């Protein structure tokens, strides 16, 4: 019995997708509802839109864009070409917005149901779809990300803590460089790190939720996972005690590093995936490592939250679409009998109303 459940959802090559177009610059997955792939067929560029609820009937349309990202919840697509941004509602067959930036947008993504984040060489912007809203500058980029490949951008629930991540080669390894920005303080901090997420967590005894920042890093000395409260606690709350724990890489994976993180607020667990397809599960409250294993031969290059199970969904270089979530009937007995940690098993059983700690 394992504490997690692995599932294959689709094989993209079986829907006529060219394997050469299955990668980070051409395939986007902004949520679990859609996958978008840019393909060139003859002289004509096209977008293929896969509805994950009806995947055998994809729409293919002509485009002239360098990047396409679908809204997390609706058939509303954003397209760009250099500095030119355009937004379309597909069901309404209409152009809803257009904007031309001063600088080329090098990376973008949806950070909520109605807001797109834009990254240029110099700065980060947020653009709301409400009313006649225009892009608003959030902060200037820090010099420590200069020349990095930008791989991610994330925020907390309230959009008060913002996090930009890039990577590059230094001393024959992949080094991550993050910029954490506080909107209320108007201050940045540079941090060495590879993958991260924010989460809301209500501690025993507190009236208000804590906002936590979790990040994983493979540094010059080994892997580490940090879980730390950002800002001063909501009035009347105890502060969350910070945790720092090891992240294991085997001796034969000397070049591997963290590429993705998703946190389940249903189970209060952190899912970590590495470039070469290793999956780790940690407890959010303590940082205790619950499980690790290799689950993809091919590299995983994009992930999202998997709504139905509160797990993680992703796509590998072969075009396998896969998910991992907590196995609710097994996790508590596993922790008790295989990890031999009755304290953690009892805590998780009562905290998240899971069955299995009636006999320890």
């Amino acid at each position: 019995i394992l504490p997690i459940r692995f599932q294959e959802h689709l094989q993209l090559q079986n829907l006529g997708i060219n394997p050469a177009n299955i990668g980070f610059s051409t395939l986007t997955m902004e949520s679990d509802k859609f996958i978008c792939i840019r393909e060139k067929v003859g002289e004509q560029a096209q977008v293929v839109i896969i509805d994950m609820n009806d995947p055998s009937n994809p729409i293919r349309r002509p485009i002239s864009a360098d990047s396409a990202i679908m809204n997390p919840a609706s058939k509303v697509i954003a397209l760009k070409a250099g500095k030119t941004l355009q937004i379309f509602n597909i069901e309404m067959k209409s152009k809803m917005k257009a904007h031309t930036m001063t600088d080329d947008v090098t990376f973008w993504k949806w950070i909520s149901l109605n807001t797109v984040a834009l990254v240029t060489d110099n700065a980060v912007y947020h653009w709301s779809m409400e009313g006649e809203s225009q892009p608003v500058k959030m902060f200037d980029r820090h010099s420590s990300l200069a020349g990095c490949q930008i791989i991610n951008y994330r925020t907390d629930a309230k959009q008060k803590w913002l996090l930009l991540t890039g990577i590059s080669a230094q001393q024959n390894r992949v080094v991550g460089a993050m910029q954490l920005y506080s909107v209320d303080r108007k201050v940045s901090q540079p941090i060495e790190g590879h993958a991260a997420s924010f989460a809301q967590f209500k501690m025993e005894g507190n009236a208000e939720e804590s906002t936590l920042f979790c990040f994983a890093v493979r540094g010059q000395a080994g892997g580490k996972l940090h879980i730390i409260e950002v800002g001063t606690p909501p009035t009347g709350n105890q502060p969350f005690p910070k945790k720092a724990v090891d992240v294991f890489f085997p001796p034969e994976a000397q070049n591997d590093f963290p590429v993705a993180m998703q946190i389940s607020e249903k189970h209060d667990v952190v899912f970590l995936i590495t470039k070469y397809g290793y999956i780790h599960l940690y407890d959010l409250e303590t940082g205790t490592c619950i499980y690790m294993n290799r689950i993809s031969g091919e590299t995983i290059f994009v992930t999202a939250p998997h709504e139905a199970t509160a797990g993680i969904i992703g796509v590998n270089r072969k075009g396998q679409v896969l998910s991992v979530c907590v196995e609710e009937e097994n996790i508590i007995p596993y922790i008790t009998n295989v990890l031999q940690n009755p304290d953690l098993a009892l805590r998780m059983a009562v905290r998240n109303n899971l069955a299995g700690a009636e006999e320890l």
Partner: peptide, 8 residues
């Protein structure tokens, strides 16, 4: 013009 060619 448009970055997407809409069907109709």
């Amino acid at each position: 013009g448009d970055l997407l060619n809409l069907d109709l």
